[PDB]
């Protein structure tokens, strides 16, 4: 799970580089290091944001899965095995599997929410703020601001 | 000596990774469009 | 109040629907975990710091004094 989270964070932080790869194509032999370092720092910040958001939303997700918990209760109990089962282990196993699926769905939702928020302000920034500043500096600052806001929306400790 | 100088600048982004450029840029991210909807539909079918 | 003697009993208590909060009190000698339930406040006393941290890690998903 840690490895897949690592890879997902890196790929979602690198896909902006994927769309910025051939769109301008300025000195790749020298801009590759800049792209790598920005991707790494964005990956770290977005991973911190993902951890914070999943931790804060797990409280709601606990009761969000209650209907599915009861649905699995129905099947785990509607059997002659449940007539002479442990009568408690069933609850433990269904809680474990529902927690696992809840964590998976919550992480997916958070990752894609941050990804969707990533490509909202960057386009308008590159379209407008280039009037007075260098386009490359504008793209760099837009990416930095997007990463910072993605990190800050997690905790929100204003 | 006559030459008509105009400040006309236009942007054409990468055709492959305006219309084609922006369309390709928008359709680049496939999972973000389907996977959340896939999870929503899975939850709906598990609840409905 | 009620005093719980076992870790498993405390974990069962903390998972009850009526449980509202758990508060951790770091004393010089020991540590106390207190669960606020409907009728009684349940206290578990742990003398081992490592065991205290391990128990703190394994708590239901849903404050320190």
Please trace the helix and strand order of chain C, writing H or E for each element: EHEEEH
Helix content of chain C: 25-40%
Biggest interface in this structure?
Answer: A-B, 17 and 15 residues
Number of helices of chain B: 2
How many strands, which pairing sense, and closed or not: the largest β-sheet of chain B? Answer: none
PDB class: transport protein
Keywords: protein biogenesis., transport protein
Entry title: Molecular view of ER membrane remodeling by the Sec61/TRAP translocon.
Chain A: Translocon-associated protein subunit gamma
Could you explain how this protein is built, in words?
The structure is cut from a larger assembly and holds chains A (158 residues), B (48 residues) and C (65 residues). Chain A is 84% helix and 0% strand. Chain A is mostly helical and 158 residues long. The longest helix of chain B is centred in the C-terminal third of the chain and has 17 residues, at 31-47. In chain B, 0% of the residues are buried. Chain C has 65 residues and is of the alpha+beta class. Helices cover 26% and strands 32% of the residues of chain C. Chain C is built from two helices and four strands, in the order βαβββα. The longest helix of chain C has 9 residues, at 49-57.
Q: Which characteristics define this entry?
A:
part of a larger assembly; 3 chains; A: 158 residues; mainly alpha; C: alpha+beta; 4-stranded mixed sheet; globular
Which helices and strands occur, and which strands form pairs?
The structure is cut from a larger assembly and holds chains A (158 residues), B (48 residues) and C (65 residues).
Chain A: H1 2-19, H2 28-64, H3 66-77, H4 80-83, H5 89-128, H6 135-155
Chain B: H1 19-26, H2 31-47
Chain C: E1 2-4, H1 7-14, E2 21-26, E3 31-36, E4 41-46, H2 49-57
Parallel strand pairs in C: 1-4
Antiparallel strand pairs in C: 2-3, 3-4
